[PDB]
Enzyme design. Sequence first.
Site, PDB file in Angstrom:
ATOM      1  N   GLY A  29       0.827  -1.187   0.000  1.00 62.57           N
ATOM      2  CA  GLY A  29       0.000   0.000   0.000  1.00 62.57           C
ATOM      3  C   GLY A  29       0.865   1.241   0.000  1.00 62.57           C
ATOM      4  O   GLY A  29       2.094   1.163  -0.045  1.00 62.57           O
TER       5      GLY A  29
ATOM      6  N   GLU B 271       7.290   1.232   7.273  1.00 68.20           N
ATOM      7  CA  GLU B 271       7.506   2.533   6.638  1.00 68.20           C
ATOM      8  C   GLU B 271       6.483   3.557   7.142  1.00 68.20           C
ATOM      9  O   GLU B 271       5.592   4.006   6.418  1.00 68.20           O
ATOM     10  CB  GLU B 271       7.474   2.411   5.110  1.00 68.20           C
ATOM     11  CG  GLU B 271       8.092   3.596   4.388  1.00 68.20           C
ATOM     12  CD  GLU B 271       9.606   3.587   4.446  1.00 68.20           C
ATOM     13  OE1 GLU B 271      10.186   2.519   4.737  1.00 68.20           O
ATOM     14  OE2 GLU B 271      10.218   4.649   4.207  1.00 68.20           O
TER      15      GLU B 271
ATOM     16  N   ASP C 109      14.531  -4.393  -3.358  1.00 65.63           N
ATOM     17  CA  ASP C 109      13.330  -3.647  -3.721  1.00 65.63           C
ATOM     18  C   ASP C 109      13.276  -3.402  -5.224  1.00 65.63           C
ATOM     19  O   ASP C 109      12.864  -4.280  -5.988  1.00 65.63           O
ATOM     20  CB  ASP C 109      13.260  -2.321  -2.959  1.00 65.63           C
ATOM     21  CG  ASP C 109      11.840  -1.823  -2.780  1.00 65.63           C
ATOM     22  OD1 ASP C 109      10.901  -2.627  -2.959  1.00 65.63           O
ATOM     23  OD2 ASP C 109      11.662  -0.629  -2.463  1.00 65.63           O
TER      24      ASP C 109
HETATM   25 MG   LIG Z   1       8.617  -3.199  -2.104  1.00 65.23          MG
END
Ligand SMILES: [Mg+2]
Lengths: 120, 592, 120
Positions: free
Chosen positions: B412, B443, B525
């Site tokens: 999200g 985060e 990532d």
């Molecule tokens: Mg990610």
Amino acid sequence: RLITEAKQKNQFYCHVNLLVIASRKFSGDLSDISKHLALAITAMQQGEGVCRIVGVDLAGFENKETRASYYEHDFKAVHRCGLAVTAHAGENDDPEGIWQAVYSLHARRLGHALNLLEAP
Amino acid sequence: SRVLLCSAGHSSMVVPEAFHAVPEGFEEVHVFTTDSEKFNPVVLNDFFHSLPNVRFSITKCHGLADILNERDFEFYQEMLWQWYLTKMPDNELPYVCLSGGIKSMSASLQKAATLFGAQSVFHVLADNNPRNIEEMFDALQKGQIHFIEMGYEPGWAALRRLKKILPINEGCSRDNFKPLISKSIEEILSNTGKSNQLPFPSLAILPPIAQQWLQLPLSANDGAWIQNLPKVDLHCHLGGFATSGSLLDQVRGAASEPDLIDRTFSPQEIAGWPRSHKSISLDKYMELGNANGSKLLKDKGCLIRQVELLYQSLVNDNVAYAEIRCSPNNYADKNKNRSAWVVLQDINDTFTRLITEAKQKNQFYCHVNLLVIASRKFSGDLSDISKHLALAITAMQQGEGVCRIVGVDLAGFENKETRASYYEHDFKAVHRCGLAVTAHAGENDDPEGIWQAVYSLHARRLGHALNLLEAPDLMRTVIERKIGVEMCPYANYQIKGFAPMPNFSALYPLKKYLEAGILVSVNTDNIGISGANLSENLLILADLCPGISRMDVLTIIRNSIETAFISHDFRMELLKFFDRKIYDVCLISIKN
Amino acid sequence: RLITEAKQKNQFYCHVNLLVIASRKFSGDLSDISKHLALAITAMQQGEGVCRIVGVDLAGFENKETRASYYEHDFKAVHRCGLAVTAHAGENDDPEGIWQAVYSLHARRLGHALNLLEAP
Ligand SMILES: [Mg+2]
Ligand SMILES: Nc1ncnc2c1ncn2[C@@H]1O[C@H](COP(=O)(O)OP(=O)(O)OP(=O)(O)O)[C@@H](O)[C@H]1O
Ligand SMILES: Nc1ncnc2c1ncn2[C@@H]1O[C@H](COP(=O)(O)OP(=O)(O)OP(=O)(O)O)[C@@H](O)[C@H]1O
């Protein structure tokens, strides 16, 4: 392929759509209901094709424990994705089961239920 | 080879019996000595002239005698070390004898032999200590000279790149004294978790010097070992592999329909990337990946090219296992019958074909699996989440294959509108079927959301979770349940900021996460946007988390293996292969 | 006291931790389960001591009458305070019972369960 072949000849043809059954196996492999529902949901999305999947089925072993209020946890998304639900009840079940199947599963159709007259 | 190494002292006639030591003849004899006038090389030269096929080398330690001073001792030690390095066989261990010389040089040479390998070290003893050659000849005729050895010494399998990095240095003195290994020797024991955190049980067989080498803190100059290090990447995004440069150009060049390509727009450049000197936001971080993504990946040929390039990069980075996050709906297009299922099938078959063709030739292949991203409020209606889950479970139901679908993902934007406690009822069926969930609970996400993700979604992993240090109960349950915590060093450093970031005070918490016992894993990532693969991601930990150790990196790899969603047998095979490869790399790492 | 006595003499010692067993009654005074849970939570809240409380055992008659779909809302409390839970569903039980004992009681450890072979 059969539908297109018949249509190309301009002869009378029979359009056919498919319904994915969800067999009420009860105790055995409880994940089968979820697998069948997801299979139908992702299979109706192929899009191209005169024949397609338009709904699922709830036929199987009918019992008080196998009522519509037993699988209702898994149907929260079948209507969300735009599918349709039929049902098979009333042959040996209770009118309460038919009522909840009509109002919980939002079954647009219904199978048999020959004893509706006893419940005005 | 069959090269002798010996020290010449007052007893200068000990070399001939060392040559006669081998029971089949010998090839080349080399002797080291000081600059004292006691040694008489004439006798040895005349003795060895009877065998011209034997290479006689005589070297004298210039400006040294009697080794009576500590400065003289270290000078002799460094010349002896350099001579041993420059006078050894390239790929076999040599034969060395040390019966000549006083205790100082003898002990130094024995320690050097232990320190650089030796095929066989032994001693020569003579009852009468012969002086003239005929006397020791007559002695060996009867058998007076006995032979004493303590056994074969494997040394360390790889330490000799010291002689490549350090040249011959024929013109040198005491000024350029190299203490390269001595500080490693000093920090052997001068410096419980670091003691029994040992993964990969074959590391016990590894010789002690490289063990204490692993106990040293990480440094920037270990990039070669990091690149040779077999790694695991679990949080990898397919849509952010190629974003700019030659990779983007060659990804564009293979599209089926060139006219549908926007070959004009390019992402804005950021100075210092990937080492961002100024903090950035998530919106700009994603805008950096605007040149790629669903807007360009619709073409089937472009998709195949991107997948093949990503797999090639994974194999190049020595990654032995990976899991890719993909969004099939984003790349679907009903105009060309490109349903999401078709896109996912194309990715799966491409990866399976690549892996099979790499394994058939018996090379290094990166076994890879897919993660189905189920974004929140990303395309409109939330029924897309149910569609994604249904597609993921149906795909996993394929049964037979090599590159399978391990599980689903939950991602999200920040919070609230993308909270992790909205879709439990939807998740019941998919999580019941047998998949796995990696919620992006982190985060700047409040600890309550992470609690819901762990305890109601049964999420086996948490994305980032940087601020977990402020929830002691949430920490305690995370370690008590060994929930993996994927963390991206470069990405989080760029989009959040950590020391030594300019005008920043907060520091990365990875070291404390590892000390506490969280099953932390290091990932990439988005490779293209962040501009850093796994190797430099792990390397940056030296200046991001000071005091990080090499055994800590090995435990990070072990944890990455531990938290991956794989079957037991496949996990066992992966562990065995990883352990053997890890042993080989640390064997050949202390070489440099 | 025993652990400290054994350790102070530098001899081999056996570290021991207690698990509070939430006894199954299902007949009368059903508040006993809540009382046991509260007692276990307060006992683990002691903090100090080499020997402490680390878990709660869900033992008793593991039949269908006392499966894991009864008190999960109550076990929310024990899970909140970072206290482990051990279940017991190993004699005369169905795979469904083991399943939601694992996934609702959040049993970090399972007792017996000898018949897992028939439920892949
Ligand atoms: Mg990610
Ligand atoms: N949805 C449909 N289902 C079945 N048949 C259809 C459908 N749509 C069109 N058709 C076909 O269109 C054709 C039109 O035929 P038309 O109006 O000329 O009548 P016909 O040829 O004299 O007799 P028939 O209707 O039996 O073919 C029909 O044959 C019919 O089979
Ligand atoms: N967590 C522990 N559990 C049990 N014993 C422990 C623990 N920690 C330390 N000890 C004790 O520390 C002592 C250290 O003993 P040591 O290393 O000198 O070996 P030892 O005396 O020759 O033989 P032994 O281990 O049987 O005592 C052990 O006796 C061990 O019982």
